[PDB]
């Protein structure tokens, strides 16, 4: 009774405790496998701040549970939530500013796919620029592996 | 010969539309072997009593 | 083809004209004399009503058409999931502005 | 209308558009998981922005 009442409370805790970590690894989207003053000054420097602490939290995600495959065999939350609602509010702001209003997310997909079509991989520069044989040889090695797999 | 899944040769290397042809064959055979392994896994998982 | 009662393939198939179900001649004989009706449909079924009657291209093309449709449907739901993952992402790229200008507001 | 190359060319065209569709499988899947990756980093970037804003306002009031 009281026993199951403490179970009630710790089950509530485990509820919000699974809701703890990033929605990113809560929709199990792919985490990069290897973690290895005028208005302009403030914007650029604090944007680089965002980059640094995103690297921090990503290595935090690594440090927690990194994969359960055969290869391998600070803040509290609602403060970040207040930050997130500030985000979405001023998101509506810069939405209404840079008009974009009526036009549709599918033509937005058209733009994304069109641009990231011409973004090509320079491995000699480890970058995307506005090469192909590297991508094909990766495809060929993946097919080599898949082939021997299906072969056994 | 196309099945051996080869990228553009010497006289075809420099031209990139040949690497478009290589995209065709390489991607096609990639998903070939993928749905292949899918069918094989599907039967060895399931097919026994069907046979 | 299987016997429409047993789930095993008939050795000597008979077919009732009424419902078209494939039956085993002894098995349908028994079910009719006991019941006088059809075991799947429930209409009246008599003793004379029943007529005693993978690698190949029709089945092979059925298999081809099968894999074609299954692939295109999987990629149809895949098309839907891609457009899903970029509608959410496109509203994300929508909302990657207030990060900048709120961090300019703070 | 169909090729008078009937089984030779019928088979060659069978294979050609079979593999064209199998290629349309791969590129579509490829941009799909490419965008899945971009969305994962975008969700991370949202969370990072939230960390940065919370840290900033913590600095702000104190």
């Amino acid at each position: 009774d009281v026993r199951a009442r403490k179970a009630r409370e710790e089950a509530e805790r485990r509820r919000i405790e699974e809701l703890k970590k990033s929605k990113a690894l809560q929709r199990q989207l792919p985490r990069p496998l290897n973690l290895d003053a005028s208005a302009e000054q403030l914007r650029d420097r604090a944007e680089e701040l965002v980059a640094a602490e995103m690297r921090g939290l990503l290595q935090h995600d690594a440090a927690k549970y990194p994969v359960k495959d055969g290869r391998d065999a600070e803040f509290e939350l609602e403060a970040l939530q207040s930050a997130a609602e500030l985000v979405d509010r001023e998101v509506a702001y810069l939405r209404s500013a840079w008009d974009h209003a009526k036009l549709s997310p599918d033509d937005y997909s058209e733009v994304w796919m069109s641009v990231h079509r011409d973004l090509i991989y320079l491995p000699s520069r480890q970058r995307y620029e506005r090469s192909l044989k590297s991508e094909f040889d990766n495809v060929r090695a993946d097919m080599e592996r898949e082939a021997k797999k299906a072969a056994k | 010969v196309r099945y051996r899944l080869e990228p553009p040769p010497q006289a075809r290397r420099g031209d990139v539309g040949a690497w478009k042809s290589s995209l065709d064959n390489a991607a096609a055979q990639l998903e070939h072997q993928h749905l292949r392994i899918l069918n094989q896994e599907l039967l060895l998982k399931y097919g026994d009593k069907a046979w | 083809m299987f016997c429409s009662i047993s789930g095993t393939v008939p050795e000597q198939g008979v077919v009732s004209t009424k419902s078209g179900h494939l039956f085993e001649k002894s098995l349908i004989e028994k079910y009719v004399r006991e019941t006088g009706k059809c075991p799947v449909t429930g209409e009246p079924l008599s003793t004379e009503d029943l007529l005693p009657l993978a690698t190949s291209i029709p089945g092979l093309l059925s298999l081809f058409h099968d894999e074609w449709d299954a692939n295109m449907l999987e990629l149809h739901n895949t098309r839907t999931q891609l457009h899903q993952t970029r509608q959410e992402l496109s509203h994300a790229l929508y909302q990657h502005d207030a990060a900048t200008r709120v961090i300019a507001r703070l």
Side-chain angles (χ1 to χ4, degrees), chain A residues 22-25 27 29-31 46 49-50 53-54 56-58 61 74-75 79-80 83-84 86-88 112-113 116 139:
Chain A
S22 37
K23 308 86 172 83
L25 228 50
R27 47 192 30 197
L29 302 177
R31 35 184 274 250
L49 243 192
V50 196
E53 254 304 354
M54 78 157 97
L57 72 101
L58 254 71
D61 189 348
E74 256 77 349
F75 262 130
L80 309 195
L86 269 83
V87 173
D88 282 56
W112 188 94
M113 281 226 307
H116 217 146
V139 163

Side-chain angles (χ1 to χ4, degrees), chain A residues 12 34 86:
Chain A
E12 204 291 273
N34 51 277
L86 269 83

Side-chain angles (χ1 to χ4, degrees), chain C residues 24-43:
Chain C
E24 191 43 22
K25 44 183 314 272
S26 269
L27 277 164
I28 191 44
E29 229 62 18
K30 188 158 29 149
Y31 203 97
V32 292
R33 47 194 231 266
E34 270 150 349
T35 77
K37 304 245 158 202
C38 176
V40 203
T41 73
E43 263 83 58

Side-chain angles (χ1 to χ4, degrees), chain C residues 9-69:
Chain C
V9 186
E11 193 55 71
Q12 212 85 301
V14 298
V15 169
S16 177
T17 300
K18 167 220 296 131
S19 40
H21 271 275
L22 213 178
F23 290 148
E24 191 43 22
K25 44 183 314 272
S26 269
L27 277 164
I28 191 44
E29 229 62 18
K30 188 158 29 149
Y31 203 97
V32 292
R33 47 194 231 266
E34 270 150 349
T35 77
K37 304 245 158 202
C38 176
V40 203
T41 73
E43 263 83 58
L45 180 48
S46 266
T47 193
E48 72 301 310
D49 290 317
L50 47 143
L51 280 294
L53 59 98
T55 315
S56 291
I57 284 132
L60 247 248
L61 66 80
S62 311
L63 252 51
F64 273 159
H65 178 23
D66 154 46
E67 273 175 305
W68 166 76
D69 205 79

Side-chain angles (χ1 to χ4, degrees), chain A residues 2 34 46 54 81 107 118 136:
Chain A
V2 159
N34 51 277
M54 78 157 97
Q81 180 40 18
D107 70 77
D118 294 19
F136 297 138

Side-chain angles (χ1 to χ4, degrees), chain A residues 27 42-43 46-47 50 86-88 90-91 93-95 103-106 108-109 112-113, chain C residues 82 85-91 93-106:
Chain A
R27 47 192 30 197
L42 195 120
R43 189 215 182 81
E47 220 144 295
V50 196
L86 269 83
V87 173
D88 282 56
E90 208 197 54
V91 159
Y93 204 162
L94 253 206
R95 262 316 302 268
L103 66 133
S104 90
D106 47 313
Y108 197 104
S109 162
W112 188 94
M113 281 226 307
Chain C
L82 176 43
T85 330
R86 34 174 76 129
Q87 300 250 291
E88 53 218 30
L89 170 67
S90 296
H91 289 239
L93 297 171
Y94 282 359
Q95 65 110 18
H96 297 154
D97 56 35
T100 74
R101 56 136 323 183
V102 139
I103 291 177
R105 277 336 287 181
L106 211 81

